[PDB]
Design a protein around this ligand. Structure first.
Ligand code: NA
Ligand SMILES: [Zn+2]
Lengths: 4, 422
């Protein structure tokens, strides 16, 4: 996941 | 090339590498057209409303529930032209990744990472776990089960929520017990994120519009790294997190980041996972591999006719790099384990891929997203296997000008700004  | 065929979405099904298929979601679904781009790897050019029955709605229920970092468009990937471009875009990214030594190493590990046959309730028999297969419609209309390691599928409702998904087991934690399981990566080559070139700006939630675009090959590689951890059953439990204390904005909101993500990014981020826990994980997985060797030694018969017991035992000897003595008894070599574990966790990282692609990229996972852009990497005039957006022999070749959304503005359409909305 790319994330925040 | 990694992908021998340059598939067109409208190519006729053949029941082999172009076919209508169904996935074991334990639910009822209509067959979807899929393409086998490489041994053990398929691409399904559809939005993922399958791996999770509770995520079959591509529409935003309200207009204020979801996080600021999200993007919705129920129509994306609903037409044949879009699916054709999706297939071509994913294929090109696989080639870009495969063109680097690191990518070749990662993809090879992935192909060799067959989910373990641990679905037998009798230790004398070796049995495949049926959720690590897909049902392929043959030319005669009948269904045939095929084992596979990876599926690239379109995103669910949130277009930019890229991630690895896999079917679980009633008891076993397949992604954390060394077994591994078929990985479904929700991903799109048609969008990308914008980040900032200055660290103080990139890591601040109130600054920057997203001047530089993340190369989608890095994004896919990132997901493939997760897939690798999961296929070898060594993913770190998401409950194991880092209470970020190196960023006032993260800390002021109690934001936590999983070790699995820090590991995957690599570089300095991986250092946030303390040595004591790192060793704890290493020992844990080491034991899991021992149990697999043990299970293989107990196997006295194989279930099915797809392959021989000796063939399957050898398949897993190669996957886990087990040692075979005189009586053909398997065991886990400490040195070989450490080397394989390290390869999958330290060698294959986002940070290392950046070095190989020679692209500009976020310097840390601990930052704040700036924006999301619509892109089209299919045309060679826009993006190539060799240079990504930074096309050699053009004004985009140097200083990452191709990734500079201001200079190479014709290749990016900003769809949403995240800055100031966290
Ligand atoms: Na976020
Ligand atoms: Zn991730």
């Amino acid at each position: 996941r790319y994330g925040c | 090339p990694f992908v021998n065929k340059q598939f067109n979405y409208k190519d006729p099904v053949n029941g082999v590498d172009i076919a209508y298929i169904k996935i074991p979601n334990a639910g009822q679904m209509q067959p979807v057209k899929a393409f086998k781009i490489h041994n053990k790897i398929w691409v399904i050019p559809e939005r993922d409303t399958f791996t999770n029955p509770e995520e079959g709605d591509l529409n935003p229920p309200p207009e204020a529930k979801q996080v600021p970092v999200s993007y919705y468009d129920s129509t994306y990937l609903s037409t044949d032209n879009e699916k054709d471009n999706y297939l071509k875009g994913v294929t090109k990214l696989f080639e870009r990744i495969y063109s680097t030594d690191l990518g070749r190493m990662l993809l090879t590990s992935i192909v060799r990472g067959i989910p373990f046959w641990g679905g037998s309730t009798i230790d004398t028999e070796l049995k495949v776990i049926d959720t690590n297969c897909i049902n392929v419609i043959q030319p005669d209309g009948s269904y045939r089960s095929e084992e596979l390691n990876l599926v690239i599928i379109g995103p669910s409702a949130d277009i930019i929520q890229f991630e690895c998904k896999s079917f679980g087991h009633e008891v076993l934690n397949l992604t954390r017990n060394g077994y591994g399981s078929t990985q479904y990566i929700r991903f799109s080559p048609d969008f990308t994120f914008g980040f900032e070139e200055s660290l103080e700006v990139d890591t601040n939630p109130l600054l920057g519009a997203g001047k530089f675009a993340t190369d989608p090959a890095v994004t896919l590689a990132h997901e493939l790294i997760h897939a690798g951890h999961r296929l070898y059953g060594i993913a770190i439990n998401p409950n194991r997190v880092f209470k970020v204390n190196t960023n006032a904005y993260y800390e002021m909101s109690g934001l936590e980041v999983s070790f699995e993500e820090l590991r995957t990014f690599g570089g300095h981020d991986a250092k946030f996972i303390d040595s004591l826990q790192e060793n704890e994980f290493r020992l844990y997985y080491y034991n899991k591999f021992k149990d697999i060797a043990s299970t293989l030694n107990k196997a006295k018969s194989i279930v099915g006719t797809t392959a021989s017991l000796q063939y399957m035992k050898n398949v897993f000897k190669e996957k886990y790099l087990l040692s075979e003595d005189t009586s053909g008894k398997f065991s886990v070599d400490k040195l070989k384990f450490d080397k394989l574990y390290k390869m999958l966790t330290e060698i294959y990282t986002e940070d290392n891929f950046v070095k190989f692609f020679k692209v500009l990229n976020r310097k840390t996972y601990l930052n704040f997203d700036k924006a999301v852009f619509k892109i089209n990497i299919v045309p060679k005039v826009n993006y190539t296997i060799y240079d990504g957006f930074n096309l050699r022999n053009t004004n985009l070749a140097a200083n990452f000008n191709g990734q500079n959304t201001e200079i190479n503005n014709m290749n990016f359409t900003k769809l949403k700004n995240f800055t100031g909305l966290f």
